């Protein structure tokens, strides 16, 4: 909606910011083979209830 409360805006803002890949130097640093962050989401198939 274009008319949203600041409290809903802030919780939506955090899901946008943390929706990221693992950095590549972290993959070298921590010696990882699983490289996908499975807590990511995509707007077409998500149901963020926030």
Partner 1 sequence: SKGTASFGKRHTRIHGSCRRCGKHSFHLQKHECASCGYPSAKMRRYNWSYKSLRRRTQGTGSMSHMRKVYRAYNSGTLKANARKYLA
User: Residue numbers of the site for partner 1 (CB under 8 A)?
Assistant: 7-8, 11, 49-50
Cβ pair 38, 20 in contact under 8 A = no
Among 2, 7, 28, 49, binds K ion (CB under 5 A): 2
Q: Min. distance of Cβ 25 from partner 1 in angstroms?
A: 29
Q: What is the three-class DSSP state of 44?
A: coil
Q: Min. distance of Cβ 37 from RNA in angstroms?
A: 4
Cβ pair 22, 37 in contact under 8 A = yes
Footprint on this chain of K ion (rule: CB under 5 A): 2
């Amino acid at each position: 909606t274009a008319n949203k409360t600041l409290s809903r805006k802030l919780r939506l803002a955090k899901k946008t910011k943390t929706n990221k890949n693992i950095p590549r130097w972290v993959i070298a640093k921590d010696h990882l083979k699983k490289t996908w962050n499975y807590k990511r989401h995509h707007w077409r198939r998500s149901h963020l209830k926030l």
